[PDB]
Amino acid sequence: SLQPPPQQLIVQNKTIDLPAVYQLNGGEEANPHAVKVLKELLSKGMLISIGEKGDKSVRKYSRQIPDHKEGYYLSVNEKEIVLAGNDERGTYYALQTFAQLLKDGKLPEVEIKDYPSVRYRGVVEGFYGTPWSHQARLSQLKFYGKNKMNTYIYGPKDDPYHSAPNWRLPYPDKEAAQLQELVAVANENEVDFVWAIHPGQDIKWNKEDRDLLLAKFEKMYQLGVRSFAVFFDNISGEGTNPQKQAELLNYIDEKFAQVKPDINQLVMCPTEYNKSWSNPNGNYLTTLGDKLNPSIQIMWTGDRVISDITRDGISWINERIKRPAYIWWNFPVSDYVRDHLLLGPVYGNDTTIAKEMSGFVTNPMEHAESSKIAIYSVASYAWNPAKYDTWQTWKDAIRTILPSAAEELECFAMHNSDLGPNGHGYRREESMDIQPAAERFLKAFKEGKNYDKADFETLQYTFERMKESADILLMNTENKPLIVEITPWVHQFKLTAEMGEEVLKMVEGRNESYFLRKYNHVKALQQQMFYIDQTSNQNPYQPGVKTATRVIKPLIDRTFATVVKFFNQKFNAHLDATTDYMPHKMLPLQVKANRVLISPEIELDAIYPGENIQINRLSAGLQKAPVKFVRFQFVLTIEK
Amino acid sequence: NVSLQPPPQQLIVQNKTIDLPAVYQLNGGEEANPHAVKVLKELLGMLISIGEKGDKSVRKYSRQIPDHKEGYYLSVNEKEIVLAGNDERGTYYALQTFAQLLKDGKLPEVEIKDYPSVRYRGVVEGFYGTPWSHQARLSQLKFYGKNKMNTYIYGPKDDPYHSAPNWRLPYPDKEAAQLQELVAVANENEVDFVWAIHPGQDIKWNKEDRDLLLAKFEKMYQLGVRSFAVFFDNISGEGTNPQKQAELLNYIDEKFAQVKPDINQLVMCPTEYNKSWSNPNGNYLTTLGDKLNPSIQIMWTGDRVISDITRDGISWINERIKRPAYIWWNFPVSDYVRDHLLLGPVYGNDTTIAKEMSGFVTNPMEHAESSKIAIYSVASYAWNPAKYDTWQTWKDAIRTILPSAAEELECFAMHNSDLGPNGHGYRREESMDIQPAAERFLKAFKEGKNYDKADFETLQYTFERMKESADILLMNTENKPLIVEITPWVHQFKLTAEMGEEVLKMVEGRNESYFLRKYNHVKALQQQMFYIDQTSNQNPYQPGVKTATRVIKPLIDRTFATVVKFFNQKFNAHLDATTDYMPHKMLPLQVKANRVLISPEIELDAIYPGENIQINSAGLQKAPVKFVQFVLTIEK
């Protein structure tokens, strides 16, 4: 099992032992990064040959080495091992494949000829929210090397030295030193560190700003950076002028990229960066495609801000930019649904269009470890799209990331995949396995027919498995940083499962007293879920923690409200059928941070000092006046 | 169909009820104890007569009023309501009883003659650890009033203005204003605020220290304090001299208590304060008995530091001190088992010995609201010991403290009662309901015999109820302070119940794969419990959080170990059967704060700077350490 799967693989069905005595051939001339991996894997003998084509070590294998950048030939048989790159990166990649072949001190007899289908592959740290930590970025870069991703584009929107206004200023010493270590680690792992700049919100089209931009790039070059990007995404005003962006990019190309001895990628992200944002008959994209120097890459997110790449979609862009688009794929980025983790499989992208793209990069979540699921899958897709297997690669990623609890992580991920409704209109599948038992159960229950015991048991099994998975994940110490990222969702996922269990016990409801016990327990679990949703992940945009939102929570919520109705009809009672706990009383009320709002007479659960009120455009300042009751969008802000 | 706590000495009911009056004439309002009138006026033509023996208002009932301090006569019929105390406190107690009779604007037709069997009843806040907050104390004093406790002895061991060396120093302004408020609220609820001082560890038997002590009592008098105590418990050296203690207390009596216009209680706690800590062949207790002025109370905790009061036990002390002991009952105090909550019923004290005690106070937990279970029960016991009903009063206390979730709190409380092993040798029953089903299930299961299905189901129902109770208590907003206190134990108790369920699924078992899932879930739940035990309640003495320790956890653990053993035999496997999570490898290792020890080679889960090693010492100068009583201290 190899990720990414190689272009060609012949397995012979013999085992070889990794040699106890071995003779290394080419160690002094091969890529030192590759040699390093080899010597770490190891400990007159069997010949091992390592090198790039043209090296004496492997020259005789020239006809086996694919004539492709980053290509390699790998061979293991009873007499020798060959590890031969088309180029230095190819040799390194041969080693990353070799490392996966190796199991319990043993190797299969194999022959591999391999190379990437897409030239640039990797990650753009390009989101809004808390930028990745230094430690997370160091862990990312080694993960990229392992999965043959050759590109990391550094551009966190909330880094003030990447965007406005402090893009003009050189990083302070501490950050500068850390960026320098990132570049060293990137180089060692055969990843191009691409430093991007995002200057467009306040850029002036004059000599001063032009010189300041170049001076900043020069400071980055001194730190070791050899690839560069200028991003004009999500800005307004003069900085959106395509003639001027092209001129600036061409000036960078001619005065910097064609002036330093060793600059690699020069990349730009347009302002009209997906089809829906492209002004019809407006010539923004035709100006870039026509004026931009042919070596400069142009990024593109597809037909929408968030979209999967189609053949019709990529033909539409390429005809305009006159070159193959450099894909900026907006998944698993969650910076517009920050209360959701997006841990499902990578899918939706046409697997036959590798020739139509210059690069394919993924914009990930602010949760770095959790993003490795999709990242590993994108690595797989971009290297060998023709053999890309969505579900197997998802499972492979999970087993790679958390071998000691892969099935528990699979369980958690399967039910934390969808985005919920959103302004981008982008959705993913979730909980599809149990979705037929769910829909069957609910249809039968609601209308008045008997449900199938099997479906009920299926639901029971799932909640049971959810609780097992949550508790095992919380205490897993194999990848602590991943567990730190996901813990709030994990707690919420567990409460979801327990709630499911108690609602199911209500459905059976042996008797009146047992029913009420179950009902009160459920009310308490709803309160607990509210508490997590108000105290975890309290960001300004989508605060809180949602989980299992597509199929499971709605099923539990609907079953609860239905069985409560049935109890009230039967026992002539008046139990509260509401499913989301709300401390305040009044369309449902909502609490977001220090706001209390009616979904587009309120009595708060206490006296708070008020700040202001907004109603639709009406507003009034409250000036800290004590408030418990309010009586007339509809939003109250309070000091909380 | 009336529940009264404490239960009155005498009660006659009629099985007729009368409505509380819309229009009523009040007689005696201006002359009765204002504290009682206020209660009556808040609780609100038909005659209502309120007053003390001697008032014109209660003249008709003078012979019905018991001739006891704090006694009262209370009567309700269709014609009139009578609330007549032998004295001012009595009238107030009449009202506290009246308040409980009142239900939904309705009163039962009743006649009550009542009085306490023990003169002084209440609480000594006399433990080590975090003193009760000011808000907690305000709540307590109000609770004492409702339950006819007339004594609050203030003596937190870790108040530096109470014990050494700063007993000599007057309270700073902030604290003094707080104590002043505590005294006002005490006075309003008919509680004697008794300020104690703990000077004996460094007292000098000279004029300088005697005057500083008297000067401190004078400052407390200016704050409104009118009852006083000197404690000599848990000290060594010259301060343990009984002649000098007696002389000092007598000086306080003669120059201060007998000189002020209105001082009430003067109380001392001896150095020999329980039989085990006394020398039968020494002169200490006989010197106090002979020399101490007869109005001075002497405290006693029983046969041991922690003990219940017996007839033989109190006889032994009374004969030596020449007066009835003022009991200092060491329950529910948990300052020596700080990882446990003690929420069980009050029991074990002889109910026939009221005449042999001048007082009975409870030394509670540092958890003030949680202590109200025992405090309510002590109030009931001390007022009417003849009628003291252990379990009904426990139930009554819980329903009083947490009416919105009484059954849930009962469940939590019944399994959080015992102290576990300790140096004081004091234990309490716990989980007695399910104990026989547990014991049978385990004996059967261990020896390869079939267990009763009913016992298995009893255990399942228990775990299920524990989970309902835990989640409901966590979210309860009726008594937020109680919930704050118990929350870490509530989390640990939920974990316990989940672990039990999963272990029982292992016993049902089904197939290999399902068993393994259950087993892995159990390991995860053990680690979670360890995390709570290492992160919550990290005090220097008994850090962490233990719950359901006497019966429920041992059962879960022993069942886990057994079923793993059988799985290993059946499948030729080597699953780990150990029942507490331990991250360091080695007899169980233990982790307490930054200490790693072998229960009376070690590989830690990481490199740590080492502090020292103790075996039964060598400092480690912060050297990096991963491999090494037997206690390793590290930096954490």
Ligand SMILES: CC1=N[C@H]2[C@@H](O1)O[C@](F)(CO)[C@@H](O)[C@@H]2O
């Ligand atoms: C090219 C592009 N820039 C924005 C935009 O897409 O949407 C996002 F990708 C998703 O919100 C955002 O993270 C990114 O910074």
Ligand SMILES: CC1=N[C@H]2[C@@H](O1)O[C@](F)(CO)[C@@H](O)[C@@H]2O
């Ligand atoms: C009279 C007495 N003083 C100590 C002793 O008993 O034990 C305790 F009551 C329990 O350890 C302690 O709280 C108290 O301060």
Ligand SMILES: [Ca+2]
């Ligand atoms: Ca070479």
Ligand SMILES: [Ca+2]
């Ligand atoms: Ca009077």
Ligand code: NA
């Ligand atoms: Na103090």
Ligand code: NA
């Ligand atoms: Na409290």
